[PDB]
Design an enzyme around this catalytic site. Structure first.
Site, PDB file in Angstrom:
ATOM      1  NE  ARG A 294     107.392 -12.865   5.016  1.00  0.00           N
ATOM      2  CZ  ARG A 294     108.516 -12.201   5.284  1.00  0.00           C
ATOM      3  NH1 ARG A 294     109.706 -12.784   5.106  1.00  0.00           N
ATOM      4  NH2 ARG A 294     108.450 -10.952   5.727  1.00  0.00           N
TER       5      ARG A 294
ATOM      6  CD  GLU B 288     104.706 -17.550 -13.351  1.00  0.00           C
ATOM      7  OE1 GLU B 288     103.719 -18.108 -13.874  1.00  0.00           O
ATOM      8  OE2 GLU B 288     104.786 -16.308 -13.230  1.00  0.00           O
TER       9      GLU B 288
ATOM     10  CD  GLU C 128     111.926 -10.302   5.874  1.00  0.00           C
ATOM     11  OE1 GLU C 128     111.930 -10.884   4.765  1.00  0.00           O
ATOM     12  OE2 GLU C 128     110.892  -9.855   6.415  1.00  0.00           O
TER      13      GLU C 128
END
Lengths: 491, 490
Positions: free
Chosen positions: B168, B230, B286
């Site tokens: 982020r 990934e 969060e």
């Protein structure tokens, strides 16, 4: 370059108090074990006992051509010497061999000293009971045992599926041994497959080996086709492939340089009481320090042949004591090392599969808190240990200034770095091990059956925020040796 | 055959209530998140909330040509549709891809819709704050955020070392974003190396991707030379390599079919306070369901360009709610699966990284006691879970007749298959996670610092010896379909 048991005995003879021989007559039944109890059995054997030399009995009553070796692995220092490393790093050094194994290779019979003598069970005069001195460890045992039998076997449907595992076998008759096989392990699954088809399972029992083989074979190994992959550890430790030879009487491989090979078959549809010949109710001493119960229903190896070297040594163990601590404990330590170091790199300083738990029940973890966030990771390292080795029972956690191989210093951490109502965490009802005689419903209202335990974490590390108050008294660094040279000679 | 974000939207449009558009003007400051709170944010967001469609906002106040997609991964069923498997098998299915990854490929700039438009930053009229809408999730945030930035970066000395990570980023100036980088992660070892040499680290931020890229990127991957490893997970999930393209303004690759790419440099020797412009004292919500504290010292990305497809979608998230449960919980479940199955094969039937813990704090393990020796192994499975994922807090154990994705049924097992003074084991003083606001010394006299917790195992399995008393009432097996066909057509 050590390639067999005799190369190892030769190395031991170059160091003091590592190898000892005796010509005084000894009875394999009870007496030989009673003698070694005093000299070097160690571990959980009842006192008095101690770490000592491996010991060779040259004069075995009733067996004028035999000699018996015990204690080869019954010291950590000794195992370190035989593999060429430091005793504190033994678990890591073998763990490196586990990671880069060297595959075994097949040799012809001409290259296999284990077949210098062949005793076919065909022979009317064959009698396993008189060919081999199988020692009886205590008078209440189920009978004579071989305790370091490295079994080779293959799946009866997929011949490329192999297995190499250490077993003990009781001598049951002129050509029969009983053999306990752990449920779920590969060789038992092999046997169950053969029996379901009504067929025997061929097997070789290989005794008297390079200690690298015995040590290496206690680690978990990958499986490759026809791999006998446990042997790859010893191949890595010596940088020379372990050599296999075809059995003479059974279609299965044997260890080419072994001292004694018992070739036979697990019989389909046959079982015996382990103590059928004594009714002692017991099997033999177990690693926790107690005699186990006789197994009421055991499979049977029917012997087809025994091959051996000239002047074959019969290798076994007593206690099983410190010899078990070494064989079982190094794998326990390696797997704890691997798990903690992958999850919390740099935290664990060392781990000791304490001899007081036979190398399985008691883990001592030495950690170092480097920073505030390390507070609370000492419990995590204990959880990692308990998760990675389910036969563990208790964990003791200490800092990097505590000698985890010194039981006085462990108890010191348990005295000045522990509060009973803060530092002790019980985890009830977790499967442990049936051979811990305290893991029973009668011992504890939270235990629902045998081999289930409360598992306890003793946190003896200094709480992070209090570390300034827990420095051990700082004696000055000095080389003591110039002050008494002759005294430091004794090392 | 899904290859990019639009393809995934087209699949969702084939199913009812999986994708929803609105042309009603929405403020990217707080209003947009406020709306999706009601429609599909899910997870640990305050209620009312629910699982719902992914949502495209076509009309963004202040940005007459922009559209903002949220909620793409905010449903486990939606995630299974987008990968073509059963929801209860998601973690296992992505685990299969983890084992046989296909390598990404490099393609020329002409094959990269992400470069259909280029906005170089040295243009005087360039303003990051006006070129793209960055939503702010709540009024107390540090500022505008991009919450689904896949960042690509290479080691500055050795270009064969690559990393792919989800971040982020808070917009802090006309050409700067602040970005947290987890210590020890390969992306930041690259940044510390470059910084130690007083040099910037070039970086791409790739937003608006195939859900298979985002989902695969949350799993651990090995490193091979020039691997961008990934992305191999997503490549194996689609069985077609994910294509990359050279960035126009920095020496680093970008996702060729991404919707938006921010190209820039992490600047050496300069930090920023996250709530610079607001003094709110918070960052953004969060995963546990609370706003986090602002980070007082964050590195900066200096933006050199932004590239984007025609009609580019800006993809981000809200909650982070169920979207975070998917992205984090699939890896959590996968690692517990691999550990318990290697240790006790055949014993675990499934595991759920429960959305009530944001995919991290709460593990439900479903086990089957097949034989007497399995009694005592359910605690072992809980220990295996706590050890392989140290950010777990509590474990709930249940049998194979309990549906672990159904919280009513979890509580049922906690009610009829549990005795409080027998079945509950507490493990104090274990490091957990600082974003659990109950892991503080003020909550518990056994907690020595923040992010340390007591961890509790709730054993709601039937004790082996008593199982014959605990058979759930057995209703006959019947296919109900024929009794109400049109009803079941929903």
């Amino acid at each position: 370059p050590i390639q067999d048991l005799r190369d190892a005995i030769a190395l031991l003879q170059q160091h003091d108090n590592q190898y000892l021989e005796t010509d005084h007559p000894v009875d394999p039944n009870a007496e030989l074990a009673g003698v070694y109890r005093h000299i070097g059995a160690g571990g959980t054997v009842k006192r008095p006992t101690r770490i000592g030399p491996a010991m060779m009995f040259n004069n075995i009553k009733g067996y004028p051509h035999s000699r018996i070796l015990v204690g080869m692995h019954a010291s950590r220092q000794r195992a370190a010497l035989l593999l060429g490393c430091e005793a504190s790093q033994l678990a890591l050094e073998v763990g490196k061999a586990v990671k880069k194994p060297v595959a075994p290779v097949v040799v012809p019979a001409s290259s296999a000293p284990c077949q210098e003598q062949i005793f076919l069970a065909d022979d009317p005069d064959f009698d396993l009971r008189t060919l081999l001195p199988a020692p009886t460890n205590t008078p209440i045992d189920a009978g004579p045992f071989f305790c370091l039998g490295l079994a080779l076997a293959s799946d009866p449907v997929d011949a490329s599926l192999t297995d190499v595992t250490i077993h003990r076998l009781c001598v049951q008759g002129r050509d029969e041994l009983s053999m306990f096989l752990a449920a779920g392990r590969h060789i038992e699954v092999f046997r169950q497959k053969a029996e379901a088809a009504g067929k025997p399972l061929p097997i070789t029992i290989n005794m008297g080996l390079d200690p690298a083989i015995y040590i290496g074979a206690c680690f978990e190994a990958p499986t490759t086709p026809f791999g006998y992959n446990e042997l790859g550890v010893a191949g890595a430790l010596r940088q020379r492939p372990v050599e296999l030879v075809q059995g003479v009487s059974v279609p299965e491989k044997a260890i080419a340089r072994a001292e004694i090979v018992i070739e036979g078959e697990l019989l389909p549809g046959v079982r015996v009481r382990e103590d059928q010949h004594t009714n002692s109710g017991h099997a033999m001493p177990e690693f926790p320090g107690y005699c186990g119960g006789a197994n009421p229903s055991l499979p049977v190896i029917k012997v087809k042949a025994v091959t051996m070297r000239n002047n074959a040594i019969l290798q076994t163990l007593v206690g099983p004591g410190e010899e078990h601590t070494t064989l079982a404990g190094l794998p326990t330590e390696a797997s704890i090392w691997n798990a903690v170091e992958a999850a919390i790199p740099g935290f664990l300083q060392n781990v000791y599969a304490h001899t007081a738990g036979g190398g399985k029940f008691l883990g001592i973890l030495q950690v170092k808190k480097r920073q505030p966030a390390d507070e609370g990771r000492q419990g995590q390292a204990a959880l990692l240990a308990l998760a990675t080795y389910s036969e563990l029972k208790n964990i003791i956690l200490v800092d990097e200034d505590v000698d985890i191989f010194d039981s006085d210093d462990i108890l010191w951490a348990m005295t000045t770095r522990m509060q009973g109502d803060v530092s002790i965490t019980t985890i009830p009802g977790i499967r442990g091990h049936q051979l811990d005689p305290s893991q029973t419903p009668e011992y504890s209202p939270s235990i629902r059956g045998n081999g289930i335990s409360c598992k306890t974490i003793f946190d003896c590390t200094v709480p992070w925020a209090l570390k300034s108050h827990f420095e051990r008294a700082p004696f000055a660094d000095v080389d003591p040796r110039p002050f008494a040279p002759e005294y430091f000679a004794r090392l």
